[PDB]
Amino acid sequence: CPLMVKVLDAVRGSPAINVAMHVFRKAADDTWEPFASGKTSESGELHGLTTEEEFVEGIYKVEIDTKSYWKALGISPFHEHAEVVFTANDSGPRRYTIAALLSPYSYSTTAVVTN
Amino acid sequence: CPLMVKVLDAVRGSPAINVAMHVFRKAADDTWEPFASGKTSESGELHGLTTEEEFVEGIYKVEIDTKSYWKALGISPFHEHAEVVFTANDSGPRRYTIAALLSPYSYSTTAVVTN
Ligand SMILES: O=C(O)c1ccc2c(=O)c3c(Cl)cccc3oc2c1
Ligand SMILES: O=C(O)c1ccc2c(=O)c3c(Cl)cccc3oc2c1
Ligand SMILES: [Ca+2]
Ligand SMILES: [Ca+2]
């Protein structure tokens, strides 16, 4: 898959399992059109969101539902979600791994881009 | 002022100066209504965004223009912007500092909420 997302929990030191996320793509009218969605596995990873053919050039937004994750662990978090917004495939196809590290009042995100 | 934003640069080891950002408040129809905006100072801080009377409970989005910041420094960035989406909750007297640490392919954000 050309787009994979991995989510980790910085409180427990574990993968963040069953985290929902939605991916959007910016449309011509400047609105966010639905693109793909899923939930992380027991490894904290979400594979198979898209295919090479469907993953065209564009501006993409990954909205990770961190609030539901913390609520299900019984925790009141600060953020509604973690958002990652980036231009993809501007110079041809790439493989993107988006990672997010979660705490109740903080998150970090990094991208690993390979050819 | 109950809302301040501080931005740091992990590549140069410096405050992130002259970074533009917009704050939005979520409307009843799920759209994002402009709320406040500005640019960080020489200390990397943006003060005076709002007042106690204007900053009511709700969902807020801070959209930080990191792409323009990196391009002004001649450094190639990954993200279109950094986003911080959070709930303001009236639990006693509270001041909110939203902090962000920027790298070209990564960013980290935390909230410092004090009395
Ligand atoms: O792709 C992976 O397996 C992977 C492994 C480690 C990390 C990681 O430590 C990490 C940290 Cl500290 C801060 C922000 C994002 C991160 O994302 C990761 C992703
Ligand atoms: O508000 C301040 O003065 C302040 C000081 C230090 C930091 C800081 O190191 C920091 C780090 Cl590593 C990661 C993410 C956010 C951060 O926000 C900060 C904010
Ligand atoms: Ca292109
Ligand atoms: Ca309340």
From Swiss-Prot, chains A, B:
Give the recorded effect for A36T: In AMYLD1; amyloid cardiomyopathy
Annotated keywords: Amyloid, Amyloidosis, Cytoplasm, Disease variant, Gamma-carboxyglutamic acid, Glycoprotein, Hormone, Neuropathy, Phosphoprotein, Secreted, Signal, Sulfation, Thyroid hormone, Transport
- Outcome of altering T51A? In AMYLD1; amyloid polyneuropathy and cardiomyopathy
Outcome of mutating T40A: In AMYLD1; amyloid polyneuropathy
Q: What is the effect of changing V19M?
A: In AMYLD1; amyloid polyneuropathy
Q: Which domain of life is it from?
A: Eukaryota
Q: What is the effect of changing A100T?
A: In DTTRH; increased affinity for thyroxine
Entry PTM: Not glycosylated under normal conditions. Following unfolding, caused for example by variant AMYLD1 'Gly-38', the cryptic Asn-89 site is exposed and glycosylated by STT3B-containing OST complex, leading to its degradation by the ER-associated degradation (ERAD) pathway. Sulfonation of the reactive cysteine Cys-1 enhances the stability of the native conformation of TTR, avoiding misassembly of the protein leading to amyloid formation.
Variant or mutagenesis effect after changing V62A:
In AMYLD1; amyloid polyneuropathy
The effect of A36D is: In AMYLD1; amyloid cardiomyopathy
UniProt-reported outcome of changing D9E = In AMYLD1; amyloid polyneuropathy
Q: Which residues carry this modification: 4-carboxyglutamate?
A: E33
Give the recorded effect for F24I.
Answer: In AMYLD1; Jewish 'SKO' amyloid polyneuropathy
Protein transport keyword on record: no
| Sulfocysteine modifications at | C1
- Cell compartment(s), UniProt: Secreted; Cytoplasm
Q: What is the effect of changing L49H?
A: In AMYLD1; amyloid polyneuropathy
Q: What is the effect of changing Y105H?
A: In CTS1; amyloid deposit on carpal tunnel; patients show no other abnormalities
What happens upon changing L101M? Loss of tetramerization
Predominant cellular place of this UniProt entry's protein: secreted
Which sites does the entry annotate for glycosylation?
N89
Relate the outcome reported for changing D9G: In AMYLD1; leptomeningeal amyloidosis; leads to unfolding and exposure of N-89 to glycosylation by STT3B and subsequent degradation by the ERAD pathway
Q: Which disease is it linked to?
A: Amyloidosis, hereditary systemic 1: A form of hereditary systemic amyloidosis, a disorder characterized by amyloid deposition in multiple tissues resulting in a wide clinical spectrum. AMYLD1 is an autosomal dominant form due to transthyretin amyloid deposition. Protein fibrils can form in different tissues leading to amyloid polyneuropathies, amyloidotic cardiomyopathy, carpal tunnel syndrome, systemic senile amyloidosis. The disease includes leptomeningeal amyloidosis that is characterized by primary involvement of the central nervous system. Hyperthyroxinemia, dystransthyretinemic: A condition characterized by elevation of total and free thyroxine in healthy, euthyroid persons without detectable binding protein abnormalities.
Anything else known: Tetramer dissociation and partial unfolding leads to the formation of aggregates and amyloid fibrils. Small molecules that occupy at least one of the thyroid hormone binding sites stabilize the tetramer, and thereby stabilize the native state and protect against misfolding and the formation of amyloid fibrils. Two binding sites for thyroxine are located in the channel. Less than 1% of plasma prealbumin molecules are normally involved in thyroxine transport. L-thyroxine binds to the transthyretin by an order of magnitude stronger than does the triiodo-L-thyronine. Thyroxine-binding globulin is the major carrier protein for thyroid hormones in man.
UniProt-recorded name of the protein? Transthyretin
Q: Organism, per UniProt?
A: Homo sapiens (Human)
- Full protein: residues contained: 30 to 144 of 147
